[PDB]
Amino acid sequence: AAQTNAPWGLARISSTSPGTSTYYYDESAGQGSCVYVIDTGIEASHPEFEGRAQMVKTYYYSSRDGNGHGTHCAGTVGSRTYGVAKKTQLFGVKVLDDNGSGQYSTIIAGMDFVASDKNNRNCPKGVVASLSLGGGYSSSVNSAAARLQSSGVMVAVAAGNNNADARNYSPASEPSVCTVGASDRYDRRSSFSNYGSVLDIFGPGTDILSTWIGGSTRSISGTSMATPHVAGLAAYLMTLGKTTAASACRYIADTANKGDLSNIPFGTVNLLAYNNYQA
Ligand SMILES: O=C(O)[C@H]1O[C@H](O[C@@H]2[C@H](O)[C@@H](O)[C@@H](O)O[C@@H]2C(=O)O)[C@H](O)[C@@H](O)[C@H]1O
Ligand SMILES: [Ca+2]
Numbered sequence: 001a002a003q004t005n006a007p008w009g010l011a012r013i014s015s016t017s018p019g020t021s022t023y024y025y026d027e028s029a030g031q032g033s034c035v036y037v038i039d040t041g042i043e044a045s046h047p048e049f050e051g052r053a054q055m056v057k058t059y060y061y062s063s064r065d066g067n068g069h070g071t072h073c074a075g076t077v078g079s080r081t082y083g084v085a086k087k088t089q090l091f092g093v094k095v096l097d098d099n100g101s102g103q104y105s106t107i108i109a110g111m112d113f114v115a116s117d118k119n120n121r122n123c124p125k126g127v128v129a130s131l132s133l134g135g136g137y138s139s140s141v142n143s144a145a146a147r148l149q150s151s152g153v154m155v156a157v158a159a160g161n162n163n164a165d166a167r168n169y170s171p172a173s174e175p176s177v178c179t180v181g182a183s184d185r186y187d188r189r190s191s192f193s194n195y196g197s198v199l200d201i202f203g204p205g206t207d208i209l210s211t212w213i214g215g216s217t218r219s220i221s222g223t224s225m226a227t228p229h230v231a232g233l234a235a236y237l238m239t240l241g242k243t244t245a246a247s248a249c250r251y252i253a254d255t256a257n258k259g260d261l262s263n264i265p266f267g268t269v270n271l272l273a274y275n276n277y278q279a
């Protein structure tokens, strides 16, 4: 399949070169997989989700995304126009309030929630969790992320936006999950993207168009935007049978475009997510 005039990031993850605008992907499109977006919620009613999104958990008075961030991230995972895995099932878990804030205890509960809740969902092709959030190092937060991964979920987490070594942030610094940095349309590390040995992969993170609340769309930037590219990519590859939850981060690094990014500090991987789709 081919989607013309796609967002640059979708084109990029199906291209060996920057500078193109068509997204190429197997039409299976993540069908039969599930992605949990652990964030501020998801506006499930947005036309772009086509009934494939639903809220399954909130820790606040409402399950509504009153912020926009969670909806944007979900849109990059799985919206029809702006998504990597256009047929995946999206589940929203609202661990962040409408200002984008949340206590680590709530975040940890949300992670253990997905580990259990997947047993209530139909996801024959596998389960992914996308965590576009973080804070200072916390072994408990890292442990929670490692549990979720161990339970059979491909956990993708944002590196952080401090232009610093991600070793000092959580859950970014957990070795067993997939830590995702951000790049821009010219194959530069995004200037805010964390880096370090703990990074596994980069994805598009600067000027990413996706869904927003009120049935709208907008373009924003962050490792929060790169992360769902990778999450959607995992779901897509899992549906195709190329990899599994336990192995998907390794597989994505193995099959990445290598050596193509600029401003990658010595000791950080130079790997850009790529779907290896050959029409
Ligand atoms: O069971 C334990 O406590 C032992 O493994 C632990 O790891 C946690 C899970 O058991 C494991 O499946 C995955 O989720 O990693 C978890 C974590 O990092 O906390 C710990 O390593 C120790 O508690 C160990 O005794
Ligand atoms: Ca720095």
Ligand SMILES: [Ca+2]
Residues within 6 Å of the ligand: 174, 175, 176, 177, 178, 179, 198, 199, 200, 249
């Ligand atoms: Ca890792």
